[PDB]
Symmetry: D3
Subunit: 32 residues, 6 copies
């Protein structure tokens, strides 16, 4: 899948699919 | 990025980049 | 705080504040 | 529910109900 | 270290040191 | 079990058994 680690909400075509980190803080894994 | 939720270790060209789930069980997020 | 374990995105006045579970599956913790 | 991000164990009226963060470190989410 | 995935609070000589799973459900990792 | 918070892959003797933290970053919990 195509995934991004997001500070904001996932894109419309993406789904919250797990957890990643941004500077040691839990972030959204958004995949499609 | 291109990522996969994995039952085994990440491929040689992938890196463990977060946490996902397979059937409600914690799994490796592997991204190339 | 007042928080909920959500299947969908956090409400307008809520913020994604952590990780909880619904039936053993990762879910958004949303707090107002 | 009523939840707090705790450094110590949950109160007797509270139950550990998820994971939150305190300065990028994992902490107990205690809810009642 | 010597650690256990626990359904209850960590023992008095143990410390909550991470997150594990019991039957796909989040649980305290308690380490001596 | 015998567990360690790992930056690299788990030893072949060990199994990835959950999540811990190394300086506020998610690390492999490797147990045996
Ligand atoms: Ca789970
Ligand atoms: Ca962290
Ligand atoms: Cl983003
Ligand atoms: Cl979603
Ligand atoms: Cl998150
Ligand atoms: Cl796999
Ligand atoms: Cl998690
Ligand atoms: Cl909801
Ligand atoms: Cl506290
Ligand atoms: Cl925790
Ligand atoms: Cl226990
Ligand atoms: Cl926990
Ligand atoms: Cl054992
Ligand atoms: Cl290591």
């Amino acid at each position: 899948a195509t995934c991004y680690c997001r500070t904001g909400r996932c894109a419309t075509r993406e789904s919250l699919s797990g957890v990643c980190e941004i500077s040691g803080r839990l972030a959204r894994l958004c995949c499609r």
